[PDB]
Point group: C6
Chain length 37, copies 6
């Protein structure tokens, strides 16, 4: 109940964080490419 | 209980971290766009 | 217990990480603003 | 169970995040190298 | 035992990650300061 | 078994993430140093 619910909230937050980390990684690659020329 | 309470604190910290990671990603996209 | 104690340490590390991620996000926004002009 | 299932989802999200963090680290190293 | 042990390893990895995130945040602030000036 | 196994996978992913975060922090420090002069 309480434990399962907290774990579901943790899972959801980590999914959102993973998506944002992916988007950030792509942008960082674009920065590297722009600075290389 | 003690386990449930710790897990709620973990959930809250991860929610805050997810929000900050999103804001960082948006700003990094803006940097990429400015440099392109 | 041992499980509760480990979870408290996890909570504390995640709180510290969240604070640092927020500070980093703010600085990244400032970089974006400086590069936009 | 419900607990096991949530933990499997947590594991999967963290695997994806670890991969992205690695890719980001490599790109950040390339930025450092470009700037000198 | 197995659960407690895994949780201790998780705690340790998160402590290391938090320290590195803090150091990164400081460096990002320095980047922002350099680009503002 | 299932809970312990998921926790071991979580531990392993977090170890990998910590290593990458450390490498990223070092590179960010190098960027700060390059931009400072």
């Amino acid at each position: 109940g309480e434990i399962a619910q907290a774990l579901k909230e943790i899972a959801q937050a980590l999914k959102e964080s993973a998506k944002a980390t992916k988007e950030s990684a792509w942008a960082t690659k674009e920065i590297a490419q722009a600075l290389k020329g």
